[PDB]
Amino acid sequence: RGEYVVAKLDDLINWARRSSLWPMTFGLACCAVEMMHMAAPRYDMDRFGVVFRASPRQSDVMIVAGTLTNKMAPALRKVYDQMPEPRYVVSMGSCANGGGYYHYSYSVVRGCDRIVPVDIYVPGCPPTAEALLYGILQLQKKIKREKRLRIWYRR
Amino acid sequence: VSNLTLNFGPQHPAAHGVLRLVMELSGEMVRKCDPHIGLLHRGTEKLIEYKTYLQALPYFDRLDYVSMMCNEQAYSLAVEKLLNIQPPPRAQWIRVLFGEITRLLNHIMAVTTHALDIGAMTPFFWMFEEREKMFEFYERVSGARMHAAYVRPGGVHQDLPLGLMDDIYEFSKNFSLRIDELEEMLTNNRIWRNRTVDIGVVTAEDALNYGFSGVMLRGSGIQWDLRKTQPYDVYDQVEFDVPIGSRGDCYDRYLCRVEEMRQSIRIISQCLNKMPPGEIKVDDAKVSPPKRAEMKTSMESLIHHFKLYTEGYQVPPGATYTAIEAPKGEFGVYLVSDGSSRPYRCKIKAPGFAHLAGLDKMSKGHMLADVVAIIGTQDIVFGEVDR
Amino acid sequence: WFEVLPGIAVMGVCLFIPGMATARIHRFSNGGREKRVAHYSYQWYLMERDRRVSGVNRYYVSKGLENID
Amino acid sequence: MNLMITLLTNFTLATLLVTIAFWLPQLNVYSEKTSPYECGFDPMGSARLPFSMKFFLVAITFLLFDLEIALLLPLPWASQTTNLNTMLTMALLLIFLLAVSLAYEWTQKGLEWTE
Amino acid sequence: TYKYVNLREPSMDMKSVTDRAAQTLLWTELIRGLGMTLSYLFREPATINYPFEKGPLSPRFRGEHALRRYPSGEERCIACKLCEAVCPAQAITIEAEPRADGSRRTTRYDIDMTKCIYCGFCQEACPVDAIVEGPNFEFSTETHEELLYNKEKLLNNGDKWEAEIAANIQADYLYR
Amino acid sequence: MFMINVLTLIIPILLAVAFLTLVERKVLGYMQFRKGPNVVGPYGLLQPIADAIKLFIKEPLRPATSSISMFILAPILALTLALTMWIPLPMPYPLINMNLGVLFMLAMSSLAVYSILWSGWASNSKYALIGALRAVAQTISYEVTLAIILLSVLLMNGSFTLSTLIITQEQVWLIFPAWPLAMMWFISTLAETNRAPFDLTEGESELVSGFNVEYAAGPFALFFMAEYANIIMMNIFTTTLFLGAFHNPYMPELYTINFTIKSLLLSITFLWIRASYPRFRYDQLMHLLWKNFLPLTLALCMWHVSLPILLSSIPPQT
Amino acid sequence: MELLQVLKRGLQQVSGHGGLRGYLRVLFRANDVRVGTLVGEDKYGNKYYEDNKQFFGRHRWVIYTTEMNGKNTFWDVDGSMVPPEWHRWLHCMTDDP
Amino acid sequence: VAAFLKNVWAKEPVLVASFAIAGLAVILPTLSPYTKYSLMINRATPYNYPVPLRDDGNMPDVPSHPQDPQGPSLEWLKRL
Ligand SMILES: CCCCCCCCCCCCCCCCCC(=O)OC[C@H](COP(=O)(O)OCCN)OC(=O)CCCCCCCCCCCCCCCCC
Ligand SMILES: CCCCCCCCCCCCCCCCCC(=O)OC[C@H](COP(=O)(O)OCCN)OC(=O)CCCCCCCCCCCCCCCCC
Ligand code: SF4
Ligand code: SF4
Ligand code: SF4
């Protein structure tokens, strides 16, 4: 029986792949500062293995923080669009998660769903660094149950 | 032919906001730079026209998010000025206190992120720890972390929780030691200095025509301040002294920001010594809501509550321009009020919107690798510039 | 504070293994003692002389004074 | 031959590791291919290029200064002979000559790097 | 007053320029000063383990939007529409049909936590303190659907913790 | 038996790279007043395996290369050089004892730049080209200077053997006879690697490592590999050249221990320098080398050609 | 001379806290291994620990244990595992448990 | 001279010190007393087997038995 090997290896590539998950910080607006406080020493990211590094090609997952204007949106989807095929999007802040304090006028896009698909919505304005961190952890716990390979085994 | 057209980059790891940029250059030298601003523009001023004064205030919080209680102070001073009100003294003092605290924030950010952009991974960390202590103050004060208003027209509401000024004192005690630790971290570093010495200088009159107001005019000649010349509140009384520099060299501007942090410590101290125990909000029931004890059990307090929330206080018509000293330089809102509840047309003034327009001349003489430092040196937030 | 020093210890084992490796492997594969160093032709000549006079074809066993007897 | 075995190995492990690194990502669980890649228009990064003489000249002076460096390289063998006078004379002479080249190029408009 | 920096006379006199050739040349200030003030390393870093430890907060902190009710719960909300009227994001909805008893409550009371900026205004405006910003920040829903709250979800949020909120309000009502 | 030697040499330098990256993240962490990774495994010892197998498994990701040759050449070259550089380094015993030696390391270190020319060449992105040309420029300019230093500090050995270096070190570390040239050669070792201050970067900058560090995925775990391994090397070759311990035969692991400790501490100083100081702008760097280092190297050199004949001690070529 | 006190701190905490296997348990559970501090009013499966006040910010800490809501298992630790009142007193909201 | 050197040593210490190391490195090998020692050392190390010559019918010196002193003596190196 090889399905034991299947599930174990799943927990291997999954275990590691989630344990690191170092993203890129898109950081449009005042949610970006709070994110940096998640990178500050007190709430520090590194303990959890998340690394701070900037490039869409190295990017494991993406954090959309700040308000997404019409003018920025296409560039955003390009940054999404050159990325390692396994990828995840975490929407930070009331703005990007469905329009926040604006949701109106014109230039602002309403939600980041209308641009790219999204996984973890973390509300707050800004979401307290603890809350954002809880969002990343919950993303990890979405990575646990991926069970991606044994359905490639088609059983 | 030669030249080029290069473009921006999406983020440095600490990036606050994104610009594009188009620089027509020569071989590793920039002849023409033309920043494209307006990338992040959320259309606040159109929104404010649709929402009453008490409602539109968080816009004046988060248009410039880094420095916050300052912008609060700007809009509040505008509505008070136009509305013929004075806040009670204790309100003015608290407002000054958190004003200079906020200035300590925006300065420590500007400096540290200016380091992280250039190199120097660590000072960002050392100091933003203390910044986290600062937000630890806000969370007690206003009941939230960053954008929480805690400022109104006719004075602040919800005075300090019992035991706050002790913590304020305790931070203010050794902040001096820590900022001096930064001054050994830099300032005689051959690297940081020798990277920024003569880059992006400015002539005083030139800065006046380009309208720079802030650490720009400070560090380059032309001694000027709004704090000293046009005191807008009890911030007049307390003693302190502003720095200047004679080299106009962008290094002077740095050191001026530093010394403004230190002086901010002086102002915080004296403020902690002078605090009168008067009251929070003004006593006029129709400008600002009553506290709940009076709200209940008393009729007129209830009415003024209910209407003052639904409709909101009416402001007589007039055109005002108020200007304060915000850590990015002179900040102001131009209010236009139809006699009404809502405002009508209010255009904020972003110091970054001026300073940014100066990169054309300032960056004319240095190659792009230091155009980095040219942008980062003048405190700027592309959330404030656009609006 | 101590977080880094175990990692540094592991770097110490990790850079310290090839030294003891190569040294012990000389002191084993090459006989009881070190491998000769042939840099100059003379020393090589002496090596292959030891080789020929070993009868083992190896310069490990050096014979000895009594081999003439 | 021994070091040549070391080169055969060290070239293998390079090759092997490279191969593993190509297999596994396109041996991965699901590989999906859509997005267009525009080589397209000239201003994406930079634009065109008017390649500038400075860098090339740095390559050049890297040559001449190499040549003088390797011409100087055998000295540790030569520092011991029965003629010391001549030795000092032409070693100090030679690298002094290197420094003469450098001093000349440092006097003319060369280098100076802001242009 | 003006107190200005960098306007100074660098001494080209001897014993200053000694330490200037020493300074440029030998990197003493760089080495000693910086390398040592980083060798300041040993101070116990400030980091907190978030699952197992949590940072400080305040009784006035603003969490998520729990509705409250009286002892012997009446649905403390009167429907009076204020919290909706002062919402600076406009995100609230109230429709109130007088119920069986003749007292008035809300049929649909909704919030978009997306749109919500977490002011605190709806916490000030409620005459009876029906809605209060919770202490708990508990979030990270997997769908844009899940961030929209019915009157029902807000109730169940209120039932999940009250004596919490009762402790906060009972603490700070003297300030408001 | 011999392939056992090879494997015992090259596998531990790879493991050394992984756990090195760990120590990097930690030292920078606490240096920055914050704990490094604790939550991958205990204390952070599972972090490399994470980085390893994940960073291998993320899919190849872009673009049309335009050269199938170079793209799969450059990584193989960068590794192969980084692995064979370790051969002569003395240890108690070299594993290949070469008469010339140190200039062989110098030579391959000179070859190491084709991975940058070709790597940055096959991008098909005309910006990564320019970036690569520039990085080649600074690496090459510090291949000038360094060579002259070895050609000086060696002149107290008397031969290139790289073994006799450990014989010279017996009485006094070579740091004392020339400290300054050792200082210049330390900073020179910072040069090629482009550790801070000398690194290029993200945000706005030349972004050579933008596409260089981005592109080629797993093969970026390779360039990653050769860069860090090469670092550990230059630290070790410093530890051998400018200092060292006493070799007590019959117990070589003693010298191996002491050697190891000093080398590791030196690399620690690399990672914390990178924490410490900002970066130079590019031209100020290149002509900082041309301004000052190279002239003073010439002076110290000729002073080491003329010195040993003064004091009448000129070294004993064997 | 002084270091013996240090190794007595570590030796003490590992000895008294958890026993032989307990150090590995709590260690992989939470990479923070702290001296046993008081008791902390267990209530549900999750156990609480309030430090002697030695230092702020990391004042107090918790282990979530297992089985909450007859659902999930250990290794799933996150927020919201704390009940409301322990959410209050664990966040510095109030100094009274 | 004095002002010139003070100013070039105020501005560019690396270059002044470089010329100092240079010049002193030029002159000092001429003056120092130890020079000849190095030469006599370097000549005292044979790389090549000393090859005998027909003794009889010669002027006596550099005698047969290696102990017989008449030849050159590096004893000055034996104690130095
Ligand atoms: C008695 C007989 C004769 C005896 C003669 C003896 C004479 C001795 C005289 C002194 C000898 C030389 C001393 C060292 C010189 C090294 C080169 C140097 O001086 O560099 C300085 C240079 C100055 O920079 P700048 O001012 O920009 O340039 C001037 C250009 N007009 O550049 C700089 O300052 C910037 C360089 C910064 C490098 C990055 C930071 C490095 C930090 C760590 C450095 C220390 C490492 C120590 C080694 C570690 C272990 C090996
Ligand atoms: C399309 C590209 C295809 C090729 C890709 C290649 C990728 C890797 C390229 C980089 C690696 C280059 C390696 C060069 C090795 C040089 C070895 C050398 O010079 O060793 C010196 C040593 C001297 O010995 P010594 O100490 O004097 O004496 C011993 C005791 N008497 O010497 C000895 O002990 C004798 C050793 C002789 C062994 C034969 C050497 C053959 C070298 C063939 C090189 C082929 C590759 C060329 C480089 C390509 C670069 C792109
Ligand atoms: S959600 Fe709030 S804090 Fe975040 S970007 Fe929008 S306004 Fe700023
Ligand atoms: S806190 Fe939210 S619901 Fe309340 S008034 Fe503000 S945006 Fe509206
Ligand atoms: S203000 Fe209070 S009582 Fe009035 S409708 Fe809103 S929640 Fe209900």
Q: For residue H52, what is the DSSP state?
A: -
Residue type, F179: W
Contact across the interface for A134 and G57, Cβ inside 8 Å: no
User: E164 — alpha (psi -120 to 50), left (phi > 0) or beta?
Assistant: alpha
Residue nearest to ligand 4 atom 7, measured at CA:
E116
The Cα of C42 is separated from the nearest Cα of chain F by a number of Å equal to: 12
Domain CATH for B6: 1.10.645.10
| B36 membership: H or E segment, kind and range | strand B29-36
Query: Which of B147, B382, B384 to probe ligand 3 with, by most ligand atoms within 8 A of CB?
Result: B147
Size of interface A-D (CB pairs under 8 A): 11
**Looking at the DSSP assignment, which residues form a beta bridge with residue B245?**
E5
> CB under 8 Å to B141, separation ≥6 — which residues?
B98, B148, B150, B160, B161, B164
Pairing type for strands A120-122 and B318-326 reads unpaired
The answer, yes or no, to whether F and E have at least 3 beta-carbon pairs within 8 Å is yes
Give the CATH number, domain containing residue D63. Answer: 1.20.58.1610
- Report the distance separating Cα F64 and Cα F79, nearest Å: 23
| Tokens at C39, concatenated | 């840099």
Angstrom distances, CA of residue F222 to CA of B163, D3, D28, F82, F138: 57, 23, 19, 10, 22
Contact assessment for residue E58 and residue B144, using Cβ atoms and an 8 Å cutoff? no
Angle at F261 between CA F256 and CA F262, to 5 degrees: 105
Strand duo B318-326 + B329-337: pairing: antiparallel
How many angstroms is the resolution? 3.9
d(CA F63, CA D38): 10
Q: Tokens at residue B249, please? A: 């060299």
Cα distances from B340 to residues B49, B289, B315, B344, B348, in angstroms, run: 11, 18, 6, 9, 20
Segments forming the whole domain that contains residue D27 = 1-115
3-state DSSP call for residue F173?
A: coil
Q: How far does residue E114's CA lie from ligand 3's centre (Å)?
A: 11
- What residues are paired with B331 via a beta bridge? B324
Q: Could you tell me which of A82, A59, A2, A11 has the C-alpha nearest to residue F53? A: A11
Q: What is the DSSP string of F276-292?
A: T-BPPPHHHHHHHIIII
- Give the CA dihedral B187, B188, B194, B196, nearest 10 degrees: 10
Query: What is the Cα–Cα distance from G31 to E52, expressed in whole angstroms?
Result: 10
- CA F317/CA H42 separation, integer angstroms: 11
CA B23 to chain centre: 29
Solved by what technique?
cryo-EM
Q: Is the CB of H19 under 6 A from ligand 1?
A: no
Does E61 sit within 8 Å of B149, measured CB to CB?
Answer: no
What's the total number of domains in chain D? Answer: 1
* Residues in Cβ contact with B103 at an 8 Å cutoff, skipping those fewer than 6 apart: B67, B70, B260, B261, B264, B326, B327
Domain-wise residue ranges, chain F: 1-318
For residue A88, the tally of other CB atoms under 10 A from its CB is: 18
Give the residue from F152, F200, F155, F201 showing the smallest Cα distance to F180: F152
Helices (H) and strands (E) in chain A, counts: 6, 4
Q: Look up the domain containing B312 and give its range.
A: 1-387
E strand residue ranges, chain A:
24-25, 62-64, 89-92, 120-122
Contact status, residue F134 vs residue F155, Cβ threshold 8 Å: no
Give B335's strand partners: B320, B346
Q: Report the distance separating Cα D17 and Cα B197, nearest Å.
A: 48
Classify residue E102 as left (phi > 0), alpha (psi -120 to 50) or beta: left
How would you label B211-244 residue by residue, b for 16+ Cβ within 10 Å and e otherwise? bbbbbbbbbbbbebbbbeeeebbbbeebebebbb
Please identify, by atom number, the ligand 3 atom nearest to the C-alpha of residue B146.
3
Q: Is the Cβ–Cβ distance between B372 and B359 less than 8 Å?
A: no
Give dist(CA D99, CA D80) in Å, integer. 24
Does residue A66 line the site of ligand 3, with CB under 6 A?
yes
Please work out whether the CB of residue C45 comes within 6 Å of at least one atom of ligand 2.
no
| G30: nearest CA partner in chain F | F39
Task: Please provide the size of chain B in residues.
Answer: 387
Which residues 93-152 of A have a C-beta within 8 angstroms of G?
A: 134, 137-138, 141
* Pairing verdict, β A62-64 and A89-92: parallel
In a 3-state reduction of DSSP, which class is residue B330?
Answer: strand
| Domain span at A77 | 1-155
Dihedral sign, Cα of residue A44, residue A47, residue A53, residue A58 = negative
Which residues are registered as beta bridge partners of E111? E149
Looking at residue F240, what DSSP letter applies?
H
User: What is the Cβ-side half-sphere exposure of residue F243, based on CA atoms within 13 angstroms?
Assistant: 18
Contact between F276 and B122 (Cβ < 8 Å): yes
- For H26, the enclosing helix (H) or strand (E) is helix H13-31
F292 Cβ under 8 Å from any chain H Cβ:
yes
**HEC secondary structure over B218-285:** HHCCCCCCHHHHCCCCHHHCCCCCECCECCCCCHHHHHHHHHHHHHHHHHHHHHHHHCCCCCCCCCCC
Q: Determine the longest span between alpha carbons in chain H, in angstroms.
A: 74
**What is the largest distance, in Å, between two alpha-carbon atoms of chain G?**
51
Task: State whether residue H51 is helix, strand or coil.
Answer: coil
What is the DSSP pairing of strand A120-122 with strand B20-26?
unpaired
**Element at E17 (helix H, strand E):** helix E17-26
Q: Is the CB of F79 under 6 A from ligand 1?
A: no
Tokens of B225: 């301040």
CA-CA-CA-CA torsion sign (B226, B229, B230, B236): positive
Instruction: Give B325's strand partners.
Output: B330
DSSP B63-97: SS-SS-HHHHHHHHHHHHHHHT----HHHHHHHHH
Structure tokens at A101: 């304090």
The token duo for F153 is 């500090």
State how far the Cα of B292 lies from the Cα of B309, in Å rounded to an integer: 14
The candidate with the shortest Cα–Cα distance to B233, out of B48, B35, B70, is B70
Number of structural domains (chain A) is 1
Residue of A nearest to D33 (CA): A85
CA separation for the pair E114, E95 (Å, rounded):
21
* CA separation, residue F267 to residues C9, F16, F234 (Å): 14, 12, 9
Instruction: Supply the DSSP symbol for A82.
Output: S
Option in A103, A125, A134 nearest E140 (CB): A134
By CB atoms closer than 10 A (0-12, 13-18, 19+), residue A6 is: middle
